[PDB]
């Protein structure tokens, strides 16, 4: 279980076989034996007990999700007297940094592939491990150079993506955050960006109409409909991953060919 890295194949290794390329704690490192570049979390035995607990809970889930393609995978672990190093596949960025790079709206076709991936990851967690992510937001949505979209860390597996029934539970509170995150990434603006404190945000979530997708942006009826369903105030009538997977929007994107890869490299090159 320790001192072996598995990326397609299985190579034995020790911490010395890894070259540290800097922080991103989480280091980007290179496995000298193959040249694979990987992410590596360093958990210090002297670390904050609470933080270590998160890492461990997250690792537990990650380790149990080897059969899910929509969740970041652990390639292996190395345990020393004063540290544990967790090797994880390295992704390009989170949806949040993609939003800032873009400097505006992210196309529906990208968000479609994203939705498929995230809903299936969230669904997998619930059905095979009984986990409720509890914190779905753009920064936990990862993308890479190969067009893959996956869910990131569940060391609890914000207040702005909190569902109505959580302010005043089930997996449908995550459904709501998903809705808000999709509206955020699609419009390029956080629905409640004008609030100054957290309580002010819960306030608008409860008193205002849900922040649905605008009607003048060319969004498909499927996409608008899928968001309207995620943003159903009454959690009692809000669909669960079960129902969401049969939505026209999911169906179209499970099928449709979208080069997330190219779109992704081009947006990262606009590094400008």
Curated annotation (Swiss-Prot):
Family of the protein in this entry: Belongs to the protein kinase superfamily. STE Ser/Thr protein kinase family. MAP kinase kinase subfamily.
GO CC terms in record: cytoplasm; cytosol; nucleus
Key word Isomerase present: no
Primary location recorded for the protein, binned into one broad class: nucleus
Catalysis performed (reactions): L-seryl-[protein] + ATP = O-phospho-L-seryl-[protein] + ADP + H(+); L-threonyl-[protein] + ATP = O-phospho-L-threonyl-[protein] + ADP + H(+); L-tyrosyl-[protein] + ATP = O-phospho-L-tyrosyl-[protein] + ADP + H(+)
GO terms, molecular function: ATP binding; enzyme binding; JUN kinase kinase activity; magnesium ion binding; MAP kinase activity; MAP kinase kinase activity; molecular function activator activity; protein kinase binding
Full-protein residues shown: 103 to 402 of 419
Domain notes: The DVD domain (residues 377-400) contains a conserved docking site and is found in the mammalian MAP kinase kinases (MAP2Ks). The DVD sites bind to their specific upstream MAP kinase kinase kinases (MAP3Ks) and are essential for activation. The D domain (residues 37-57) contains a conserved docking site and is required for the binding to MAPK substrates.
Domain Protein kinase span(s) in chain numbering: 18-250
Keywords: Acetylation, Apoptosis, ATP-binding, Coiled coil, Cytoplasm, Kinase, Magnesium, Metal-binding, Nucleotide-binding, Nucleus, Phosphoprotein, Serine/threonine-protein kinase, Stress response, Transferase, Tyrosine-protein kinase
Cofactor: Mg(2+)
Annotated GO biological process: apoptotic process; cellular response to interleukin-1; cellular response to lipopolysaccharide; cellular senescence; Fc-epsilon receptor signaling pathway; JNK cascade; positive regulation of DNA-templated transcription; positive regulation of ERK1 and ERK2 cascade
Source superkingdom: Eukaryota
Enzyme Commission no: 2.7.12.2
Function summary: Dual specificity protein kinase which acts as an essential component of the MAP kinase signal transduction pathway. Essential component of the stress-activated protein kinase/c-Jun N-terminal kinase (SAP/JNK) signaling pathway. With MAP2K4/MKK4, is the one of the only known kinase to directly activate the stress-activated protein kinase/c-Jun N-terminal kinases MAPK8/JNK1, MAPK9/JNK2 and MAPK10/JNK3. MAP2K4/MKK4 and MAP2K7/MKK7 both activate the JNKs by phosphorylation, but they differ in their preference for the phosphorylation site in the Thr-Pro-Tyr motif.
Protein name, entry field: Dual specificity mitogen-activated protein kinase kinase 7
Catalytic-site annotation from UniProt: 135 (proton acceptor)
Positions of ATP binding: 41
Region DVD domain, annotated ranges: 247-270
The protein's assembly and partners: Interacts with isoform 1 of VRK2. Interacts (via its D domain) with its substrates MAPK8/JNK1, MAPK9/JNK2 and MAPK10/JNK3. Interacts (via its DVD domain) with MAP3Ks activators like MAP3K5/ASK1 and MAP3K1/MEKK1. Interacts with MAPK8IP1/JIP1, MAPK8IP2/JIP2 and MAPK8IP3/JIP3 scaffold proteins. Interacts with RASSF7, the interaction promotes phosphorylation. Found in a complex with SH3RF1, RAC1, MAP3K11/MLK3, MAPK8IP1/JIP1 and MAPK8/JNK1. Found in a complex with SH3RF1, RAC2, MAP3K7/TAK1, MAPK8IP1/JIP1, MAPK8/JNK1 and MAPK9/JNK2.
Regulation of activity: Activated by phosphorylation by specific MAP kinase kinase kinases such as MAP3K1/MEKK1, MAP3K3/MEKK3, MAP3K11/MLK3 and MAP3K12/DLK.
Cellular compartments annotated: Nucleus; Cytoplasm
Tissues with expression: Ubiquitous; with highest level of expression in skeletal muscle. Isoform 3 is found at low levels in placenta, fetal liver, and skeletal muscle.
């Amino acid at each position: 279980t320790g001192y072996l890295t598995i990326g397609g194949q299985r190579y034995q290794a020790e911490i010395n076989d890894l070259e540290n390329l800097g922080e991103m704690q989480v280091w980007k490192m290179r496995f000298r034996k193959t040249g694979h570049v990987i992410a590596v979390k360093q958990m210090r035995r002297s670390g904050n007990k609470e933080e270590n607990k998160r890492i461990l809970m997250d690792l537990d889930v990650v380790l149990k999700s080897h059969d899910c393609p929509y969740i970041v995978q652990c390639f292996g672990t190395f345990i020393t007297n004063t540290d544990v190093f967790i090797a994880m596949e390295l992704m390009g960025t989170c949806a949040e940094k993609l939003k800032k790079r873009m400097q505006g709206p992210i196309p529906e076709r990208i968000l479609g592939k994203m939705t498929v991936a995230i809903v299936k990851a969230l669904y997998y967690l619930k059905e095979k491990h009984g986990v409720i992510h509890r914190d779905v937001k753009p920064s936990n949505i990862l993308l890479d150079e190969r067009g893959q979209i996956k869910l990131c860390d569940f060391g609890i597996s914000c207040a702005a993506y909190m569902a109505p029934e959580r302010i005043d539970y089930d997996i449908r509170a995550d459904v709501w955050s998903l809705g808000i995150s999709l509206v955020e990434l699609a419009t390029g603006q956080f629905p409640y960006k004008n609030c100054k404190t957290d309580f002010e945000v819960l306030t608008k979530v409860l008193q205002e109409e849900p922040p649905l997708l605008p009607g003048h942006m060319g969004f498909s009826g499927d996409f608008q409909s899928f968001v309207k369903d995620c943003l159903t105030k009454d959690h009692r009538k809000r669909p669960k991953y079960n129902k969401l997977l049969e939505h026209s929007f999911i169906k179209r994107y499970e099928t449709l060919e979208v080069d997330v890869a190219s779109w992704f490299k081009d947006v990262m090159a606009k590094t400008e």
